[PDB]
Write a protein that binds this ligand. Structure first.
Ligand SMILES: CC(C)(COP(=O)(O)OP(=O)(O)OC[C@H]1O[C@@H](n2cnc3c(N)ncnc32)[C@H](O)[C@@H]1O)[C@@H](O)C(=O)NCCC(=O)NCCS
Ligand SMILES: CC(C)(COP(=O)(O)OP(=O)(O)OC[C@H]1O[C@@H](n2cnc3c(N)ncnc32)[C@H](O)[C@@H]1O)[C@@H](O)C(=O)NCCC(=O)NCCS
Ligand SMILES: CC(C)(COP(=O)(O)OP(=O)(O)OC[C@H]1O[C@@H](n2cnc3c(N)ncnc32)[C@H](O)[C@@H]1O)[C@@H](O)C(=O)NCCC(=O)NCCS
Ligand SMILES: CC(C)(COP(=O)(O)OP(=O)(O)OC[C@H]1O[C@@H](n2cnc3c(N)ncnc32)[C@H](O)[C@@H]1O)[C@@H](O)C(=O)NCCC(=O)NCCS
Ligand SMILES: CC(C)(COP(=O)(O)OP(=O)(O)OC[C@H]1O[C@@H](n2cnc3c(N)ncnc32)[C@H](O)[C@@H]1O)[C@@H](O)C(=O)NCCC(=O)NCCS
Ligand SMILES: CC(C)(COP(=O)(O)OP(=O)(O)OC[C@H]1O[C@@H](n2cnc3c(N)ncnc32)[C@H](O)[C@@H]1O)[C@@H](O)C(=O)NCCC(=O)NCCS
Lengths: 157, 157, 157, 157, 157, 157
């Protein structure tokens, strides 16, 4: 029973994220997408919306489930009966930041992190940039799953 | 039957490498260490020696096997009935180099690459630097498995 | 009619910025400096002041004009009848950030971005650091155009 | 008469290179592709072949010409009556290397360098990696212009 | 009378910081740890607490003293009768940020900066990450001096 | 008796190198420039020439001496009765490479490394690039000490 957790805010989930989910689901018997919500409430979509968008965008991955994460990600990972986190990397700068978190996570809980390199076509896709461009009237529909596009179009209509 | 290939020259295998092997073996049902030898013959240890050093240093990993790699790593991976490569990363510079190879490997064969961050204590360990220091009389025994230390000490004696 | 837009907050414009303007003006028939103001109002100089400082510091560039930017930079670029943005880069870290924006801008509007490497002597010059040092009593007059120096000295007097 | 030189070994030219040529040709009245050949003779294709491959792959760019470069690139640029070099960048590591060359080129001859960010889909494409994979039997035909593919297939047949 | 200033917020001081202090104290006749407090008051420990934690964690360094810093660090350095700042670096990204500050500091006051590379075992240790993990119930006691651990345990008890 | 060793090939010494020497000599009671020669004999200037160029370019630094280095730099450092190496850094990429060497040097001999950031004006200066440009007829005289310029001009005359 090999398993990985894919943690993130997913606000909203992008096609870059879905790519990572697919790639994790191909290599681990079970994948859990863990949505870690910002407490301060500064995000675009609420938690219920973020969950629905991930679920709606991952109906083709039978071995993937979606859950809200609470506390340290390592504690969530251990509560799933797993010892691996899977995350995507776009750049060397991303790597150096994630490296610190991964080494810390291994230190405190013995939980390992496996990184996958972004698909080339989604290298520039982030939730933040997608939101920024969307908020200014730009068309980012090709970078996001249709379930997200539907919701985005409803907010600007 | 989840499985990963850990490719490299391993000339010689270091404790950084063994760390990666252990971490891969913890998350995949099967791990294959693939030794890719330089054709030009520029290395310190011959292929037979490199194989023995890896085998001798991995007797504690029952689900790991060691094999000589030939051709494209993706072809070797596919010949193992696998679709994943696992490699370690120390720095952002490493990442940008490996990113290119990973995206190329995915393009040509659909084989994915999972990276793990170096253990902090082995961040500066490479086969090349270990060899360079050893060749100049420095003591690198704490950075290498005893099976490698034994062989290194025999070459300088 | 080759043309480029040089976008930024320019708060205030520095000699690093003016260097980029000069270099853009040398290679494109027309250059438009686009001042994109922060809506939240968190900047040191107001928009009118920023415009005046850029204009006053660029009187030697006949093919350059200064305009306030609104909305997506790509929309502004297209409204100028142009398809190129020109920006300066100081470091690899800068590059990886700007790379994302450039690829996004190309995706959404087909607008390209041309980067120029900082002049060595201005490599450490940013508006932010200049302001931080100025606010603490440091002398940054050699890093800024005289029109900016005049205004800075008036705020601290 | 705005103009840029796009220098490189182009051994062979890739679709990443052609992308840069197209993007340069869109912004400058004239583009000159300068093929700088390695004297030591270590390349895959000879100079005549490299020229033909670039020419054959750029028949859609009326304002682009192809020439063999000799000496310092800045001297070649000046001999074209130009003051700009255009090059592509894939990563921050690329940038830091090219930054040194650009600042040196500006110092010695006042020739400026404009960089463009790689198209996402060609981020992992290099002549070197394409050749390495091709030499090992991998299929890189989707990364190279047909005129290059034709010649590559003839060498391995 | 060679001397260096080691500036920072030290909120709280970590074993990574203490490592730097020890290494500076080994090479300079005098070391001054300068605590620069955030005016906005956003930190975990107050200034008095930060001073005490540094002092309590450095009782083994006879040539080190601890002082609160005010204004530009270069002005503080000069007020100590010194011309050197010493700081630790973990990553290339850290370096590019610190490089800007160091060049600025040299420009405005002729004060130089000497960097030391992190000890491998503390590469992932930062005050910020330690605090974040501590706030979520994680155990970071092995990354911090006992005087800090005592105070941390008192806040969560 | 604080002291540092500044190791390198210095082939030839540049104004960037001399800048580092001056900055080291300002902070340490004694500085030793250690010339480590390539055994394979691939350099431009012989060892005697490199020594003379460094000596001739450092007559203004009374506390600096020049010596040929043999073996591991850490062994040379210890033979000087010192425990510090001083080196310059230009970029984050430089840092990640030097970081490995510094951590290795500390591991094997307890010798520490202090890095200084390049002066902005010499950021693009390296011995290698200076030689490459010089060999092609470019003028690099403003990047090198006059004692080096004299010798360079004699080789091309
Ligand atoms: C929530 C965490 C993981 C941060 O998540 P983050 O906001 O970075 O996720 P985000 O939704 O932005 O993206 C998720 C992941 O997708 C990756 N990604 C995004 N876009 C792409 C793309 N186009 N291609 C590949 N990967 C991508 C990102 O690199 C990231 O790794 C972190 O805050 C956390 O662990 N919080 C819990 C508390 C904790 O454990 N703290 C201790 C940390 S040591
Ligand atoms: C053999 C390959 C993989 C290169 O291997 P390389 O020489 O880099 O392996 P090396 O033994 O140096 O190290 C192996 C791996 O261990 C990692 N590593 C080394 N030290 C450490 C450490 N201390 N911590 C973590 N990871 C580490 C390295 O990052 C590397 O990823 C490559 O040449 C290859 O794939 N060859 C086959 C032909 C091919 O497929 N070519 C097409 C490539 S797209
Ligand atoms: C305003 C934008 C461009 C950001 O500008 P920014 O604040 O980075 O500009 P700033 O004034 O800080 O600097 C402007 C440029 O000068 C460059 N620069 C600064 N100092 C130097 C120097 N010494 N040498 C060379 N270049 C320099 C910077 O790298 C930057 O590229 C961005 O927010 C934007 O595009 N906003 C509009 C909305 C939009 O289009 N969003 C979608 C983005 S995909
Ligand atoms: C020939 C020069 C320019 C080096 O060329 P190089 O071999 O790097 O070119 P190469 O063919 O590898 O690639 C050419 C350019 O295409 C870019 N590129 C390659 N692939 C891609 C891609 N997928 N996307 C975007 N850009 C790309 C590269 O970044 C490079 O900038 C250099 O050696 C030179 O200038 N020689 C002349 C002597 C000289 O002037 N020396 C002084 C230098 S200061
Ligand atoms: C206070 C300053 C120095 C910033 O300090 P900062 O908050 O980065 O310090 P912090 O406590 O985070 O860490 C201090 C130093 O320790 C280093 N460090 C932290 N952890 C580690 C580790 N594990 N290993 C090695 N080094 C480490 C950091 O890289 C940093 O260099 C800066 O804001 C400042 O100079 N303020 C005064 C005003 C001023 O001079 N402004 C002009 C700047 S040009
Ligand atoms: C000789 C060593 C130090 C490598 O030296 P290198 O060739 O990098 O020196 P080089 O002359 O190229 O430059 C010397 C230093 O000057 C710095 N530098 C160069 N130009 C500049 C500049 N413009 N500004 C600032 N610094 C600069 C470089 O970053 C380098 O740090 C290394 O090979 C060595 O230590 N050899 C001995 C054997 C050994 O100890 N091996 C074990 C290593 S762990």
């Amino acid at each position: 029973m090999t398993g990985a957790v894919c943690p993130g805010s997913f606000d909203p989930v992008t096609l870059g994220h879905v790519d990572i989910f697919e790639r994790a689901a191909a290599q681990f018997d079970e994948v859990v997408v863990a949505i870690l919500v910002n407490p301060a409430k500064t995000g675009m979509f609420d938690l219920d919306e973020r969950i629905a968008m991930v679920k709606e965008s991952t109906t083709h991955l039978p071995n993937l489930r979606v859950q809200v994460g609470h506390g340290l990600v390592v504690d969530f990972v251990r509560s799933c009966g797993m010892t691996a986190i899977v995350k995507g990397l776009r750049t060397g700068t991303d790597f150096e930041y994630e490296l610190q978190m991964a080494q810390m996570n291994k230190h405190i809980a013995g939980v390992d992190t496996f990184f996958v390199a972004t698909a080339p076509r989604y290298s520039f896709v982030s939730s933040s940039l997608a939101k920024e461009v969307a908020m200014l009237g730009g068309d980012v529909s090709e970078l996001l799953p249709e379930p997200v596009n539907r919701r985005l179009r409803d907010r600007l209509n």
